[PDB]
Coordinates of C-alpha atoms and ligand atoms in Angstrom, one line a residue:
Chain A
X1 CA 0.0 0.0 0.0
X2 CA 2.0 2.9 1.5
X3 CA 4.7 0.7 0.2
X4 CA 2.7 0.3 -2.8
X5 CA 2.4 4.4 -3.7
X6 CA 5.9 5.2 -2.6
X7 CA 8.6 5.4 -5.2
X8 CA 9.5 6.6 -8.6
X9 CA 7.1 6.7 -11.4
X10 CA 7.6 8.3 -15.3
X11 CA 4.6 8.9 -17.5
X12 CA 4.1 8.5 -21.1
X13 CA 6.2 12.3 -22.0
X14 CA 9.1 11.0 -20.3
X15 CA 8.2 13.6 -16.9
X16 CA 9.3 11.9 -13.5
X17 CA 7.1 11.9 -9.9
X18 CA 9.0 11.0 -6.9
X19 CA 6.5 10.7 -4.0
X20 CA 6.3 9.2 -0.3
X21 CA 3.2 7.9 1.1
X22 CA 2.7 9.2 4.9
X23 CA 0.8 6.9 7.2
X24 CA -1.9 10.2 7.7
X25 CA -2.4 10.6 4.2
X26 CA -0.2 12.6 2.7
X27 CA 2.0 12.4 -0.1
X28 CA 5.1 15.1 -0.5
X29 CA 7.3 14.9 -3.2
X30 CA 8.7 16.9 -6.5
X31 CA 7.8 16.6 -10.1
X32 CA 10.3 17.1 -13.2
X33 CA 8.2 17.9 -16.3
X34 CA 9.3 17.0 -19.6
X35 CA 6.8 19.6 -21.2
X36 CA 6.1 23.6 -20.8
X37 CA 7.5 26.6 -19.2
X38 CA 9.5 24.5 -16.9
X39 CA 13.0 23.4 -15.5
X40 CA 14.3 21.3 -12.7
X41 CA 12.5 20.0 -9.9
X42 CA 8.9 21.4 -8.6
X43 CA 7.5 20.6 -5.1
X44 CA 4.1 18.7 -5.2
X45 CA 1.5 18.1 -2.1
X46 CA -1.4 15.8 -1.8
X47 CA -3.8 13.4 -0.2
X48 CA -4.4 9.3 -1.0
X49 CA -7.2 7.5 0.7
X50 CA -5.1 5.5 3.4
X51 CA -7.4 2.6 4.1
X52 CA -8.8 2.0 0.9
X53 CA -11.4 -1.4 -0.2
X57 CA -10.9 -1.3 -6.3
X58 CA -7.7 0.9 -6.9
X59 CA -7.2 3.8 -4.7
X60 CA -8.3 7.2 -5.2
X61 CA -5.8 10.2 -4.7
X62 CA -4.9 13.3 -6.1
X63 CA -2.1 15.8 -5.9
X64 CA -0.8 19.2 -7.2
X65 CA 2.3 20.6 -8.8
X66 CA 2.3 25.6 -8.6
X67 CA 5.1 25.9 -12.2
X68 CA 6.8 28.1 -9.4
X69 CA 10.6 26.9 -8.6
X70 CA 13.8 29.3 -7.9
X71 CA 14.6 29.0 -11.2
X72 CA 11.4 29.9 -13.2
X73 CA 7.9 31.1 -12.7
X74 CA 4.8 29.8 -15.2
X75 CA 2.3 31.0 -13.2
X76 CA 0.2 28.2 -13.3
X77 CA -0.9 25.0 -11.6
X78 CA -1.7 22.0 -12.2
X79 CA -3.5 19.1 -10.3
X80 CA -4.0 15.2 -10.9
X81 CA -6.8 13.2 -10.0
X82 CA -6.5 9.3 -10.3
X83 CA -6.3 6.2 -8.8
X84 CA -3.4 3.5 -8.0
X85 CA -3.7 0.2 -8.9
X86 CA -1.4 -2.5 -7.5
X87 CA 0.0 -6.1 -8.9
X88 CA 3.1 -7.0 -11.4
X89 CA 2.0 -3.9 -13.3
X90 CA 1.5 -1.1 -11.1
X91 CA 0.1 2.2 -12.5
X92 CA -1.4 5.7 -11.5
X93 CA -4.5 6.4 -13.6
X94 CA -5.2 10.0 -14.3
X95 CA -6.9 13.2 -15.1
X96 CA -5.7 16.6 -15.0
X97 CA -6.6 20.2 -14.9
X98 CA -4.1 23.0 -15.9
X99 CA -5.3 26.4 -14.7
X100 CA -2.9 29.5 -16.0
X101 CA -3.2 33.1 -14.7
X102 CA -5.1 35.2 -16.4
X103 CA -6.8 38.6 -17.1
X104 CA -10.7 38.8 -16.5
X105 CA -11.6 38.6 -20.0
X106 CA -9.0 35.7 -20.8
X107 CA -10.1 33.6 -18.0
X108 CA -12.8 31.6 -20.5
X109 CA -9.5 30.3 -21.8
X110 CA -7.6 29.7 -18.8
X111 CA -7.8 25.6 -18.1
X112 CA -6.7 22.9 -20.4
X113 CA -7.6 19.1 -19.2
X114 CA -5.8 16.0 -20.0
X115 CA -4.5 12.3 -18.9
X116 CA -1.7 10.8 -18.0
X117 CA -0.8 7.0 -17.1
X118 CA 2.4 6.6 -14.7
X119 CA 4.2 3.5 -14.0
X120 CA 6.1 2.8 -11.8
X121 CA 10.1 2.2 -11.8
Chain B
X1 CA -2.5 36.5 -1.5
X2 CA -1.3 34.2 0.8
X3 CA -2.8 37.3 2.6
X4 CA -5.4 37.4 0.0
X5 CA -6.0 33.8 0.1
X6 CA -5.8 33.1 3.8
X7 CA -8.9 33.2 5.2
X8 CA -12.5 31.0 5.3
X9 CA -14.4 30.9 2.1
X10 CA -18.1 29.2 1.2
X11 CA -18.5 28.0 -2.4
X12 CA -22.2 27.6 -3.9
X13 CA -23.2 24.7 -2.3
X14 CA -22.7 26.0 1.3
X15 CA -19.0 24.1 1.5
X16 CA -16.6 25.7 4.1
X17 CA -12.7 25.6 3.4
X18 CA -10.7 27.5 5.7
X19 CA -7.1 27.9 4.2
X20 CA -3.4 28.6 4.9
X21 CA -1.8 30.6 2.1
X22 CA 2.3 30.2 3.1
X23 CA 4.7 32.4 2.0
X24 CA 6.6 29.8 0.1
X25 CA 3.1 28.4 -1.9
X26 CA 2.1 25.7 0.5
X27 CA -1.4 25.8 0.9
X28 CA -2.9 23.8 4.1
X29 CA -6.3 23.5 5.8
X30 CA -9.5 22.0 6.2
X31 CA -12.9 21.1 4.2
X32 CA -16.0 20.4 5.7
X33 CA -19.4 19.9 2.8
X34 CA -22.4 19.9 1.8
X35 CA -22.9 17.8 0.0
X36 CA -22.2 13.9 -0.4
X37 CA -21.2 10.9 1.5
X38 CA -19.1 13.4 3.9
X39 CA -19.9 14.6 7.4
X40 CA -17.5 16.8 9.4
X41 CA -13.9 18.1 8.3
X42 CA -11.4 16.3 5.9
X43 CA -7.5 18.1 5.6
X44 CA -6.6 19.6 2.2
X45 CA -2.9 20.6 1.0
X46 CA -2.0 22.4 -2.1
X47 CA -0.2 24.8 -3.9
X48 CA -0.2 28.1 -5.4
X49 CA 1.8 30.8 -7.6
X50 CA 3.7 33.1 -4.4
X51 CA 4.7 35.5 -6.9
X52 CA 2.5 36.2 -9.8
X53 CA 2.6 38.4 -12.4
X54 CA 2.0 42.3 -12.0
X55 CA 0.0 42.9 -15.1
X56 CA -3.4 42.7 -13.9
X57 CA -3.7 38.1 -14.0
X58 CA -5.3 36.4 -11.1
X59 CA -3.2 33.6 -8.6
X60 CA -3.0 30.1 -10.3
X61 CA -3.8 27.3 -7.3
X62 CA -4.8 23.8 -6.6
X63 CA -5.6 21.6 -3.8
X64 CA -6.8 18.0 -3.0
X65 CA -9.1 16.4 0.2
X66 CA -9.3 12.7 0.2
X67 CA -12.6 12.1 1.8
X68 CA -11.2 10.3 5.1
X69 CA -11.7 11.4 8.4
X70 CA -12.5 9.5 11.9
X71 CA -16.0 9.3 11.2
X72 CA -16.5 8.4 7.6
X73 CA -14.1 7.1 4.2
X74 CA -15.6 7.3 1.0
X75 CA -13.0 6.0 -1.1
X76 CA -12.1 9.1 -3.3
X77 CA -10.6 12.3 -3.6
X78 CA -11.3 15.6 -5.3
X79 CA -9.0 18.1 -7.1
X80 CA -9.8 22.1 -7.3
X81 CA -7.8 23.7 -9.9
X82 CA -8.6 27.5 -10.7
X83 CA -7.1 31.3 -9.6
X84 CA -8.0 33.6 -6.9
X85 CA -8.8 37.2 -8.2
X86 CA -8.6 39.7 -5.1
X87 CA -10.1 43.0 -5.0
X88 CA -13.2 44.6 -2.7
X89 CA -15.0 40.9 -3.6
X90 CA -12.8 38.3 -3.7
X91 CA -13.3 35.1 -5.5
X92 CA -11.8 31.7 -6.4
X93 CA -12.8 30.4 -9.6
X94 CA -12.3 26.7 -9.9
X95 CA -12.8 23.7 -12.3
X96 CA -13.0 20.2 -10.0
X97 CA -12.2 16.2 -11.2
X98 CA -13.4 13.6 -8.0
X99 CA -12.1 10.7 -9.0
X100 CA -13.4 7.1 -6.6
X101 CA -11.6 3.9 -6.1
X102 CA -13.4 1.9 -8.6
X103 CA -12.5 -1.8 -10.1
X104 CA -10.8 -2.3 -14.0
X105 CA -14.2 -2.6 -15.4
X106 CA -16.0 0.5 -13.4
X107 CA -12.8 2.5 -14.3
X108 CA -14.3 4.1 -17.2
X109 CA -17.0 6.1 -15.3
X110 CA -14.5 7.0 -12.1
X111 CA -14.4 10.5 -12.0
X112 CA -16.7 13.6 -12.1
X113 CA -16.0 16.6 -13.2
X114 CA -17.9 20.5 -12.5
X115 CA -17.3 23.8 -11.1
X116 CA -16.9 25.9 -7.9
X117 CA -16.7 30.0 -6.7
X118 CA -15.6 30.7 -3.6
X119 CA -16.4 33.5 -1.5
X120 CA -15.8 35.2 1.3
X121 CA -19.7 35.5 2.7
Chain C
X1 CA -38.7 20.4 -24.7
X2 CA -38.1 20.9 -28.1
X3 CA -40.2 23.3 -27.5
X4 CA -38.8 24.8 -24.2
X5 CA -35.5 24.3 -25.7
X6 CA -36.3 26.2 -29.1
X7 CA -34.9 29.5 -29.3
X8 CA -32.9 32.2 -28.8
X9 CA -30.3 31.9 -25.6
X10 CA -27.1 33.9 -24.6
X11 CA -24.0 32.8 -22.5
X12 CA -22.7 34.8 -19.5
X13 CA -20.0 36.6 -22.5
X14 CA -22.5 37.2 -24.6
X15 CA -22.7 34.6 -27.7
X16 CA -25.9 33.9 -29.1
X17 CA -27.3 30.2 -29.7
X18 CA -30.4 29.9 -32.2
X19 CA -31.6 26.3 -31.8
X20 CA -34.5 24.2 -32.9
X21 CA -35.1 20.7 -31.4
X22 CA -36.7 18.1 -33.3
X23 CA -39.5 16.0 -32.5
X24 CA -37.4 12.9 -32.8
X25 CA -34.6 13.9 -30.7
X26 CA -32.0 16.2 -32.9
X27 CA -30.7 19.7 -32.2
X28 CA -29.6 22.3 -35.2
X29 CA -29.3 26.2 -35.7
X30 CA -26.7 28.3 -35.3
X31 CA -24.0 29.5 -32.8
X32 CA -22.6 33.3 -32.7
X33 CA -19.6 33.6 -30.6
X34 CA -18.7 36.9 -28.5
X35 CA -14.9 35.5 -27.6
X36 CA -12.1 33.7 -29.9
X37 CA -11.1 33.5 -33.5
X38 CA -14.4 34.1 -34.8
X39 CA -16.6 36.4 -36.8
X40 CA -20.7 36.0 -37.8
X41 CA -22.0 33.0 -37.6
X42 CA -21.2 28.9 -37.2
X43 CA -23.2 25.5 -37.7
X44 CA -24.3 23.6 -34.8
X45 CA -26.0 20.0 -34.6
X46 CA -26.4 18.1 -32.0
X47 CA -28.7 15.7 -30.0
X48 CA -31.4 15.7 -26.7
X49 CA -34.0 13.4 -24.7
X50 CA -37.0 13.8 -26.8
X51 CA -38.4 11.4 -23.6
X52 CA -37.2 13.0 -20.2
X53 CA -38.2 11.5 -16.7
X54 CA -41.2 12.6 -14.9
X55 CA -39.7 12.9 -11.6
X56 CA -38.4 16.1 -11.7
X57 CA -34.8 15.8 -13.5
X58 CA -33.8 18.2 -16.6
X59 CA -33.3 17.0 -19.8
X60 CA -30.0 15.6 -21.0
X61 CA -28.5 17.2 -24.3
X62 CA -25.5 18.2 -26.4
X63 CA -24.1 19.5 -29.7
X64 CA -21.0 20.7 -31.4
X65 CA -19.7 23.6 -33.5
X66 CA -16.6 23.0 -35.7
X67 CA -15.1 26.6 -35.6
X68 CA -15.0 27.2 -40.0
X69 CA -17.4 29.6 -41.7
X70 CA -17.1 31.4 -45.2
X71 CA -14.5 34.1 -43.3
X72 CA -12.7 32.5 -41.1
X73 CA -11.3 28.7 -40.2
X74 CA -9.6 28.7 -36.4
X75 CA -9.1 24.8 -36.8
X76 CA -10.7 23.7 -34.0
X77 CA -14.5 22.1 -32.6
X78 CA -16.3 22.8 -29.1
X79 CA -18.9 20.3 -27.8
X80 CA -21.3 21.0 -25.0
X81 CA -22.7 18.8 -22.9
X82 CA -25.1 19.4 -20.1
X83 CA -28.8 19.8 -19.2
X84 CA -32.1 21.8 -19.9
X85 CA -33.9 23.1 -17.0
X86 CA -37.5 24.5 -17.6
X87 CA -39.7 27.0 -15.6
X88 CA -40.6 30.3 -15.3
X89 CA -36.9 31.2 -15.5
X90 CA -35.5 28.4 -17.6
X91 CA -32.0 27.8 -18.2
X92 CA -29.5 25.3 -19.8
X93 CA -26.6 24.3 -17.3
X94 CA -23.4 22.8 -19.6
X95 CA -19.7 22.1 -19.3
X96 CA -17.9 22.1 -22.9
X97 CA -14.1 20.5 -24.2
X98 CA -12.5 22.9 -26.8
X99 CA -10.2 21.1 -28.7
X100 CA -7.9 22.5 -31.8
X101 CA -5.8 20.6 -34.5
X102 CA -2.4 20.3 -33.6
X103 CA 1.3 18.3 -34.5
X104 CA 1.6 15.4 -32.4
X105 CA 4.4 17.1 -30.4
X106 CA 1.6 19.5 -29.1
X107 CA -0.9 17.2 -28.6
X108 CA -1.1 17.3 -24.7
X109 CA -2.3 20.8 -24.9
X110 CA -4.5 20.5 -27.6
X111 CA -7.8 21.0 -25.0
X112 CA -9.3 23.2 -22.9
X113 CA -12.6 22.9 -20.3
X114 CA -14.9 25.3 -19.2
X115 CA -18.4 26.0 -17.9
X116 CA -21.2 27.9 -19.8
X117 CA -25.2 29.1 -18.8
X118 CA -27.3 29.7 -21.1
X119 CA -30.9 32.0 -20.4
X120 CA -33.2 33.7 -22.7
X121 CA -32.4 37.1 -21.8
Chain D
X1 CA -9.8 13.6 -45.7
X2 CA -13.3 13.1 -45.9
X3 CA -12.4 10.0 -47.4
X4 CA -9.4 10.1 -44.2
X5 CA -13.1 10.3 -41.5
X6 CA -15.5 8.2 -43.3
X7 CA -15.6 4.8 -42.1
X8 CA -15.9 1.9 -39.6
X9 CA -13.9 3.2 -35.8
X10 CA -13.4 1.2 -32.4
X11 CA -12.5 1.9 -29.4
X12 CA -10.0 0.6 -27.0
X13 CA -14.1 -0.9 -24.7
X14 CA -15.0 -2.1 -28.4
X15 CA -17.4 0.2 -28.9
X16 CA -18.1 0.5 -32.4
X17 CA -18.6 3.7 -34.2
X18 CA -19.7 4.0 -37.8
X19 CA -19.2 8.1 -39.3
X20 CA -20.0 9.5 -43.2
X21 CA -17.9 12.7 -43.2
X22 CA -20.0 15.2 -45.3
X23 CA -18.7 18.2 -47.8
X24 CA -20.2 20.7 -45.7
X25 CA -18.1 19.5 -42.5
X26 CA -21.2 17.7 -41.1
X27 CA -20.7 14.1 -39.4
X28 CA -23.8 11.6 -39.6
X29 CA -24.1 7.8 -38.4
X30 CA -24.4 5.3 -35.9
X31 CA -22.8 4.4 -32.5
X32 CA -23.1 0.8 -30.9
X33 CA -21.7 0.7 -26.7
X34 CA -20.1 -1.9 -25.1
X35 CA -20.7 -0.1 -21.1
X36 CA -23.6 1.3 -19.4
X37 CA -27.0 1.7 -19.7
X38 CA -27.6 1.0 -23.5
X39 CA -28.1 -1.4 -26.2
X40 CA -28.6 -1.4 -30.0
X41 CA -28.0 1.8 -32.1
X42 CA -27.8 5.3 -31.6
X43 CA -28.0 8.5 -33.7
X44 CA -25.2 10.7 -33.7
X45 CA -24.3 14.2 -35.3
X46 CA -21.6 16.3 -35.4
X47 CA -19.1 18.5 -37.5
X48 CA -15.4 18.3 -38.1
X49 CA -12.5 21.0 -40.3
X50 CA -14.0 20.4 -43.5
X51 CA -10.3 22.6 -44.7
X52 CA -7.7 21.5 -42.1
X53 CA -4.0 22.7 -42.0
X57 CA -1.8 18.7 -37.3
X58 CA -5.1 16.9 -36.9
X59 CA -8.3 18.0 -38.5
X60 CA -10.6 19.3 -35.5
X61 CA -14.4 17.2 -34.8
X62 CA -17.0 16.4 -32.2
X63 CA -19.9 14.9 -32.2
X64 CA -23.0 14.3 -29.7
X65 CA -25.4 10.7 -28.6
X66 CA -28.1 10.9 -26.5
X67 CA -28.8 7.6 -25.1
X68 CA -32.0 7.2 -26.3
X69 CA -33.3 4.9 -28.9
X70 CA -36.7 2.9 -29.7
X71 CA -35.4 0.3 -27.5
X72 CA -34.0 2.0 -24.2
X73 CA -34.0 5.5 -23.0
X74 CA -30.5 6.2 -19.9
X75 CA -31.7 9.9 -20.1
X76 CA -28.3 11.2 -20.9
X77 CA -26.2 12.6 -23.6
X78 CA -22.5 11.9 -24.4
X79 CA -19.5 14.4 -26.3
X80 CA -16.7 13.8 -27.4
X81 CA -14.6 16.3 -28.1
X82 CA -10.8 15.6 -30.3
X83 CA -8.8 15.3 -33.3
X84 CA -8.2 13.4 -36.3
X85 CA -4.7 11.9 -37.0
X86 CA -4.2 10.2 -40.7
X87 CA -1.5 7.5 -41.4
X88 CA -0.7 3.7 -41.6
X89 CA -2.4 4.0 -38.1
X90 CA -4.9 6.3 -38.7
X91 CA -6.6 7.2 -35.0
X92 CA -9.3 9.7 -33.7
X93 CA -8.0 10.9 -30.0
X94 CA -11.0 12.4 -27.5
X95 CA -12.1 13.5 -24.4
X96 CA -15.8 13.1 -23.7
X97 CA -18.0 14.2 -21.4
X98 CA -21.5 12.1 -19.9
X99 CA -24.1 14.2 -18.3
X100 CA -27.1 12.7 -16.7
X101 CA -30.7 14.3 -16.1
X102 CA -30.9 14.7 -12.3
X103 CA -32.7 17.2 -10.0
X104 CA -31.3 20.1 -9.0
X105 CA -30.4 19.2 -5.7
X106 CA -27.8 16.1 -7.8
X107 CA -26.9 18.0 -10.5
X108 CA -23.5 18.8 -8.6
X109 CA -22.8 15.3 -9.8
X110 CA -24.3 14.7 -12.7
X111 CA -21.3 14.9 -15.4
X112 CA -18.6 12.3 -15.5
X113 CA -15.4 12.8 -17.6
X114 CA -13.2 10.6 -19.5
X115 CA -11.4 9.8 -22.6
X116 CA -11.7 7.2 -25.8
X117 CA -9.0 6.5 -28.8
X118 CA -10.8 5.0 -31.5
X119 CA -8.9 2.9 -34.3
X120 CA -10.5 2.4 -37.7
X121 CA -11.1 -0.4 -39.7
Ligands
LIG201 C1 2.3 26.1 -17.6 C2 3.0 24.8 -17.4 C3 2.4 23.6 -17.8 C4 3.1 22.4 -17.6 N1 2.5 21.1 -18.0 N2 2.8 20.1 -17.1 C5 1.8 19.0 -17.4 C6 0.5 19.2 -17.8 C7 -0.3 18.2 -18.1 C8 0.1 16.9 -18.1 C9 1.4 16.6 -17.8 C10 2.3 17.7 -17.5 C11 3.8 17.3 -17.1 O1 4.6 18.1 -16.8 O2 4.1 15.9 -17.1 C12 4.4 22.4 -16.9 C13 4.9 23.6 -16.5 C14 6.3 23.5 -15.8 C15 4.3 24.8 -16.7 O3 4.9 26.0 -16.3
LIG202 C1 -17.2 11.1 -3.5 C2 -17.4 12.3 -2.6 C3 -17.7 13.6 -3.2 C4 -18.0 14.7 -2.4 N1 -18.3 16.0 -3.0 N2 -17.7 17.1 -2.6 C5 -17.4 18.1 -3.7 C6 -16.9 17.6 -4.9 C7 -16.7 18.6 -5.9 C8 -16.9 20.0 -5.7 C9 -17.3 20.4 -4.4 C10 -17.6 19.4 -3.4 C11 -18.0 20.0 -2.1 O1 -18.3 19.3 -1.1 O2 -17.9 21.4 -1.9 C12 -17.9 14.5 -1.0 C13 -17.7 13.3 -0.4 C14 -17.6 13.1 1.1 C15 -17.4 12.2 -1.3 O3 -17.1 10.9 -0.7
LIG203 C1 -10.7 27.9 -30.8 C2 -12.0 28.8 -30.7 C3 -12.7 28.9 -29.5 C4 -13.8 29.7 -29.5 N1 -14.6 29.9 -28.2 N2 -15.8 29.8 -28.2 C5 -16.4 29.2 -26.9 C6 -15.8 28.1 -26.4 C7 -16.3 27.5 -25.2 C8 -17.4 28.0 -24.6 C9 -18.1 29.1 -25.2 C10 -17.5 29.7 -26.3 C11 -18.3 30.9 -26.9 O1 -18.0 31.5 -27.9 O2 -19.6 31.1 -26.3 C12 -14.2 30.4 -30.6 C13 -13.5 30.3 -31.8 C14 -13.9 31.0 -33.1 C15 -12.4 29.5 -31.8 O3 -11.7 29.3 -33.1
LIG204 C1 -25.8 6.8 -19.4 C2 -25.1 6.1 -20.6 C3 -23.7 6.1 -20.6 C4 -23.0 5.5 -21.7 N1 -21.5 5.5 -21.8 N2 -21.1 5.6 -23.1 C5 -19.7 6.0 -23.1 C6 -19.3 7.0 -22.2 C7 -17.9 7.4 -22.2 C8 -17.0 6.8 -23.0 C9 -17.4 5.8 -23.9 C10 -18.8 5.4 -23.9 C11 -19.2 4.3 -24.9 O1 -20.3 4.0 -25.1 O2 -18.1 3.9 -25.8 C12 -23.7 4.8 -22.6 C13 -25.1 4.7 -22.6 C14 -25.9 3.9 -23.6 C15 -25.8 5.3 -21.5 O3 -27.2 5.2 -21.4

């Protein structure tokens, strides 16, 4: 389980998650993206379900903020963990940017990504 | 921000979620709804933009709640994603994705998605 | 139905949607949009529950506009999806994926999700 | 083109989708599902880049309702047209449900389909 969510995981663009699993719920970590106005390591924060039934639902979420550049804009994963010889993290995402008032209609983009795990 | 952000907000529904803007874009606090199989508080952690841009563009943030707590586990977890825009009435727009355990073949119809403002009042 | 949802109805920005629903369960008119790449009008067609429940729900419906006219071609479709709400004040709630041709290299990006309410003023 | 959308699709739940691409950048056919609260045929409509550039832009719309069963919901989806030697239509779809105002918070799911053709 805990053992189970913690560890190294690349999705399908070639970006890298490394997470830890707290006994409470939380999961810490940092993301390297392979796409966008990014560079080096970002800090992500989020919550799994820690006694779950079926996969495991959790979610987590990545501010493009680092000491080396600023995207201003966020983006958050919503999925599930699945266990057994072929592990994976199933998910959906939101990426909201900053914008003005009358840009905001065009201010999320949605997507999926599929990690496994290393 | 953090300023701007910290503080108790109500969406549409008649949720609460008191936050913790850090000044190093840690978000922390708690979630208590309306609506579904939830009763009392849940903790939420996120993240937002602790230095945006000075042209006039709201605060990208995010957070996630699993919905755990002493009392209750429903097996899922939501994402918020969305910016807060400050000024005399304050708002956070957001887009949401709740996602619930589910098995292989229930995987296709796992997660929700819709929309949330939060207020102050 | 068909006939509450026959008409003329605006979004919060402004666009105008002229629609006619069918007996049998289709949707078609005509979409003017206030934001984007985009000048006079666009096709729509699109589909509805010509049989709703009688408990109280709204009715279930959808459609699309591919974004090309005789003046301009932005490459790209919306679809709508949501749900028709009669009554004295009668509204249609939706949520709608925006998605424009691109390489493969810039396929991740290629969508974009948002919220729109439609009334008859 | 037209010739690239017209045809026989399935996708990865072997759903089967069947699509005439028309001059006028109308789409018209039939769509059979392998999940939910359906069987037989259903209508569907929708409209793709009759002039594309990248993938040529389409959606279309089913509401689950045909002479034999009514789900009182509607499906989307939303994506892109890619031609080759492994020609593919790539989406993201969204389900919404009738409900009454008090569940209408819940009443749209989201997900995402790749359809192969024939
Ligand atoms: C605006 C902005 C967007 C961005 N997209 N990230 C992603 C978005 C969706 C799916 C995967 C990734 C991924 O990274 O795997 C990354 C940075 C750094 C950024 O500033
Ligand atoms: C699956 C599940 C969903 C749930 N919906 N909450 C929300 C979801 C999206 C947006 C707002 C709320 C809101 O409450 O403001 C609450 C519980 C307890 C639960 O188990
Ligand atoms: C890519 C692109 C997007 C666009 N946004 N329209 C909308 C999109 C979503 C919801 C409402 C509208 C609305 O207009 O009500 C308009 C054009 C012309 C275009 O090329
Ligand atoms: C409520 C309801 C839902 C439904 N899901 N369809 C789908 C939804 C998402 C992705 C693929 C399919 C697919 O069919 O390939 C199908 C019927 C008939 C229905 O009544």
């Amino acid at each position: 389980a805990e053992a189970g969510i913690t560890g190294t995981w690349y999705n399908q663009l070639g970006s890298t998650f490394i997470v830890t699993a707290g006994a409470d719920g939380a999961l810490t970590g940092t993301y390297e993206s392979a796409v966008g106005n990014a560079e080096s390591r970002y800090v992500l924060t989020g919550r799994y379900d820690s006694a779950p039934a079926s996969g495991t639902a959790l979610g987590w979420t990545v501010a493009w903020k680092n000491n080396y550049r600023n995207a201003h804009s966020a983006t958050t994963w919503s999925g599930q963990y699945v266990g057994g010889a072929e592990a994976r993290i199933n998910t959906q995402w939101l990426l909201t940017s900053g914008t003005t008032e009358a840009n905001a209609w065009k201010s999320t983009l949605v997507g999926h990504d599929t990690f496994t795990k290393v």
